[PDB]
Amino acid sequence: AQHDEAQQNAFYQVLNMPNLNADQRNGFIQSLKDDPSQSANVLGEAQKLNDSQAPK
């Protein structure tokens, strides 16, 4: 809101991934928190894991 659009976007996206489970999405959130630089990477990995676990 103040700024950091990529940072907050990545966080919101990782939350809003319904094909992940709790352990996975929380894992990615903690990875994001630890490595704020790696917003794009964490987002990519999370999106890939969500996509691969999609029901179809």
Swiss-Prot record:
Use in biotech settings? Important immunodiagnostic reagent because of its ability to bind the Fab and Fc fragments of a wide range of mammalian immunoglobulins.
Could you name the domain of life of the organism this protein comes from? Bacteria
Residues passing through the membrane, by range:
none
Instruction: Name where it's found.
Output: Secreted, Cell wall
Immunoglobulin-binding region E repeats (start-end) = 1-56
Quoted from the entry, the domain comment is:
Each of the immunoglobulin-binding region repeats can bind the Fc region of an immunoglobulin.
Q: Give the protein's biological function.
A: Plays a role in the inhibition of the host innate and adaptive immune responses. Possesses five immunoglobulin-binding domains that capture both the fragment crystallizable region (Fc region) and the Fab region (part of Ig that identifies antigen) of immunoglobulins. In turn, Staphylococcus aureus is protected from phagocytic killing via inhibition of Ig Fc region. In addition, the host elicited B-cell response is prevented due to a decrease of antibody-secreting cell proliferation that enter the bone marrow, thereby decreasing long-term antibody production.
Similarity comment: Belongs to the immunoglobulin-binding protein SpA family.
Q: How does it assemble?
A: Interacts with host TNFRSF1A; this interaction leads to the stimulation of both surface expression and shedding of TNFRSF1A.
Would you tell me the protein name for this molecule? Answer: Immunoglobulin G-binding protein A
Source organism per entry reads: Staphylococcus aureus
Q: Which residues of the full protein are shown?
A: 37 to 92 of 508
